[PDB]
Amino acid sequence: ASGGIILIIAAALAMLMANMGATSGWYHDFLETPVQLRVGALEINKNMLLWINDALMAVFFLLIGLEVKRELMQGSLASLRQAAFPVIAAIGGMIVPALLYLAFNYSDPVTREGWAIPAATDIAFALGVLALLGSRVPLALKIFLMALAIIDDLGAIVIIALFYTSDLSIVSLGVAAFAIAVLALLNLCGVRRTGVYILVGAVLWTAVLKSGVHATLAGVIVGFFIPLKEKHGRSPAKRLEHVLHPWVAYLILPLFAFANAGVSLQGVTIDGLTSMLPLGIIAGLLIGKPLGISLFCWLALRFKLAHLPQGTTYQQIMAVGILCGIGFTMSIFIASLAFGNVDPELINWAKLGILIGSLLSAVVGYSW
């Protein structure tokens, strides 16, 4: 559970940096620093936070691409029947948190763009809370929760990168398509040097630099093509996932939390927190997650299209539904995509709703 504590400390310092007279200012101005890259005629203008997030979420989603692949062929999602329960819980864990959010935000066209914010679940945080009491919690839950949180996060990133994301340039797609093809020919020819895939993946990542959500999905694509075969008792993907895990839990996620979870608290009142944007997120996380998860799981069980993990009791299914209300880093990233190039206070009110919702979901889910 070590990864979860170091993440909260990182968020604690950020709130501290953002709310002290001496630090707040240098903290805000650093993150808002403009970074202009100019390559001949090409020109990429992103502030500092954008450049950092695009790199951090790249490697983070590279690890998820490996974990999706290992669970899709060797774990929970391997068969179509075992994957019935995590998938059903995920759709409910997405539509109900979004419906609640939309119920509050439908009348404002500017805020109803962030409907996917309370659909994300911080895997590292939620696993930390489970591992905090994980002396003898059922093994199936920790893999169920992992598979559950991943499909929503990836699906959200997918649907954000299909519709709501802006189109790329013609040249950028040609290189992206060619880079993916080289990753395919590398896999079909059976090369097992992990660094070569990372090399081709770097070209992929660079071509779509202007789109932060595409540079993110570039990580998932690379993680899919790292070979998983076990020749001579060695696997490139299993080895790479083993290398990335401590770096993601102890550096990538803490840095992402430190650079994004700091909002000023000055002037924040209960009436402000009950406006449509933060409360829609709070209600989406604190209520929408355990509602949609329990409802669909209960609907699954009764209507024969179901399964059940070993040692489940079905009260522990709705329990982790509450723990899935911890959006945290993943919801913050979604909010940064939904609320870029709009009014700067939209992202600030969003983080406040996420932090309150996630903190309530963590404490409430800890009582069970």
Add this chain to the structure above:
Amino acid sequence: DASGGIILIIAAALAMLMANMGATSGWYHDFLETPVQLRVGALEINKNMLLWINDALMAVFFLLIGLEVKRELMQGSLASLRQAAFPVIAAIGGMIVPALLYLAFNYSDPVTREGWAIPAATDIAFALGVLALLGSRVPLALKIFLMALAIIDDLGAIVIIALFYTSDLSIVSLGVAAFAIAVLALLNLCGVRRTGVYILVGAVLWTAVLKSGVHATLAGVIVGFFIPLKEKHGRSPAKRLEHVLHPWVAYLILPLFAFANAGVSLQGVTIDGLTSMLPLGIIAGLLIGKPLGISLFCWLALRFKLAHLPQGTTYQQIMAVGILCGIGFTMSIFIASLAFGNVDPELINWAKLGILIGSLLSAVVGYSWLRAR
């Protein structure tokens, strides 16, 4: 095992093809001179494309060197404890004679006098690549004497350019550079064995000195110096990293640096141009300065009992390494690109011609004569 030297030759041929057929001469030249501006707040870095590539490639190449040096200096053939001082005395000859021979031509020209360290370089990979071409039963110490000898010349050349012939770094750069070593020194004392943590900190050292190619190059050897070489549990971080790092240098870093820096348009190149003081000085300093300098210092050192002799020497085999040390190639091209920055652009082009003709003459003479003995 000679595959690295051959791939390094194909890449230079391709580069020469790119820079001479009209269909590609435009793209190759324009791409390498493409300007690249990074503006971080008020900070700003302007370097053409080729400089960014070389500062990144030569940082990785010299990280591998720092690993090899520390091994060969703390538990290797060169070693500390002043035992194998035979290459150290030979290296001073591999730098003094090529420099004095070069300066004999270019003394009257204050501009070209700056490139006196160009023939002092030696392309390690290609020189051993031409030795591995014959390396069925060549003395092991010979190759690891060549490899130990070539580094002192290349390291010393980079050091002198970094200590005198380089431009200034701001105090903010120097400060972070010094703090980046303090955390490296804290890591080394505390016994941290994660290779990545040393590379993370190294990345900070590299970017802090990014305004200077030599310092960016010096940052590679320093990271390779501070990585623990200890053999705890039969696993060494330096040896593990070098075994991963070595194939990428021979197959990707060096052929890329060659493909990017060994392409020179040959239109109008006459025989009068190659006999100019600048290229001929590089030709002579390599084709003659290396063999005459290396052999004369081993001769001067052996007779006066200050020296040593590797097992299976014959001393005529040394003179084959000498003519083989006239292989400047990539290493001299890098030195040339540093000594001839922010001056007339044709200087680097004429320097490159003197390097390839001098190395080719050294490779052929070095091969055809060592194949006789």
